[PDB]
Design a protein around this ligand. Structure first.
Ligand SMILES: COc1ccc(-c2cn(C)c(=O)c3cc(C(=O)N4CCN(S(C)(=O)=O)CC4)sc23)cc1OC
Length: 127
C-alpha cells in the first residue's frame, strides 16, 4: 500500500506575506482547533496504509490536514487569509466526501468546523 506525497509546505518562489489576518489564523483559528479533544485525526495527512483505507486517495484528490496548515502558517507560505481558509474548508469537505454520513470522524469534523466558523466570523480588518 501507498500514500501520495504530502501537500506542499515550502516553495521559495511562491510570494509570501505576514499579515494580521494570517497571524489571527495561526494564533486564534489553528490554535483553537489544534487543542480540541477531536483534533487528533486531523493533525497530520491521512495515512491510508496504517489506517487501511486503500481507496482514500482514489476518492480524495485534494488532500489537506491541520499539520500541513500549521506548517504553512509557521513557515509563512501564504499570500492571503483566503488561501488558508480554503485549506481548512478543503479538509472538512474531504472528511464529509469520504466518510459515511453519521460516522465518528464526521461528528469530530463538525465540532471543529463549528469553532472554525465562529472564529472566522471575527476575522480582523486588514491593517
Ligand atoms: C493518527 O490516527 C488517525 C489519523 C487520521 C484518521 C482519519 C482522518 N480522517 C480525516 C478521515 O477521514 C478518516 C477516516 C477513517 C476510517 O478509519 N474510516 C473511514 C473509511 N472506512 S472505509 C471501510 O470506507 O475504508 C474505514 C473507516 S480514519 C480517518 C484517524 C486516525 O485514527 C483514528
Amino acid at each position: 500500500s501507498m500514500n501520495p506525497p504530502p501537500p506542499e509546505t515550502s516553495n521559495p518562489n511562491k510570494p509570501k506575506r505576514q499579515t494580521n489576518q494570517l497571524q489571527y489564523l495561526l494564533r486564534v483559528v489553528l490554535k483553537t482547533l489544534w487543542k480540541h479533544q477531536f483534533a487528533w485525526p486531523f493533525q497530520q495527512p491521512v495515512d491510508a496504509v496504517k489506517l487501511n483505507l486503500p481507496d482514500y486517495y482514489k476518492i480524495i484528490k485534494t488532500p489537506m490536514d491541520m499539520g500541513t496548515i500549521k506548517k504553512r502558517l509557521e513557515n509563512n507560505y501564504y499570500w492571503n487569509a483566503q488561501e488558508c481558509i480554503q485549506d481548512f474548508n478543503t479538509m472538512f469537505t474531504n472528511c464529509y466526501i469520504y466518510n459515511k454520513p453519521g460516522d465518528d470522524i464526521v461528528l469530530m469534523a463538525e465540532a471543529l468546523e463549528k469553532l472554525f466558523l465562529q472564529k472566522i466570523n471575527e476575522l480582523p480588518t486588514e491593517e
